[PDB]
């Protein structure tokens, strides 16, 4: 189980476009993947869960990965949220 803290460097945070792209990207991994904002939590495979987080631009978020590829998933999700 890996916890990595990141800043959402996305113009409208996790809006429809950014949440939908995360859901697509995250299907490539075998690991369970969740995002956490304070006490709000969502499975990264759930468009509805991601949207319900209400993540805005520059929000501090925790990426939680758990499974065979958990370190790869953690690095690539953090990269997606800082660089694009």
TrEMBL record:
CDD domains: PTS-HPr_like. It holds the Pfam family PTS-HPr. Its main location: cytoplasm. Residues 1-84 form the HPr domain. One of its GO terms (cellular component) is cytoplasm. Keywords: Cytoplasm, Phosphotransferase system. The keyword Cytoplasm applies. It is found in: Cytoplasm. GO terms for biological process: phosphoenolpyruvate-dependent sugar phosphotransferase system. PANTHER family: PHOSPHOCARRIER PROTEIN HPR (PTHR33705), PHOSPHOCARRIER PROTEIN NPR (PTHR33705:SF2). This is Phosphocarrier, HPr family.
């Amino acid at each position: 189980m890996i916890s990595t803290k990141v800043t959402i460097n996305c113009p409208a945070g996790l809006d429809s476009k950014a949440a939908a792209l995360l859901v697509q990207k995250v299907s490539k991994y075998s690991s369970s993947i969740w995002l956490e904002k304070g006490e709000r939590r969502a499975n990264a495979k759930s468009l509805l869960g991601l949207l319900s987080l209400g993540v805005e631009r520059n929000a501090a978020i925790t990426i939680i990965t758990d499974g065979e590829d958990e370190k790869k998933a953690a690095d690539e999700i953090s990269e997606y949220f800082t660089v694009g």
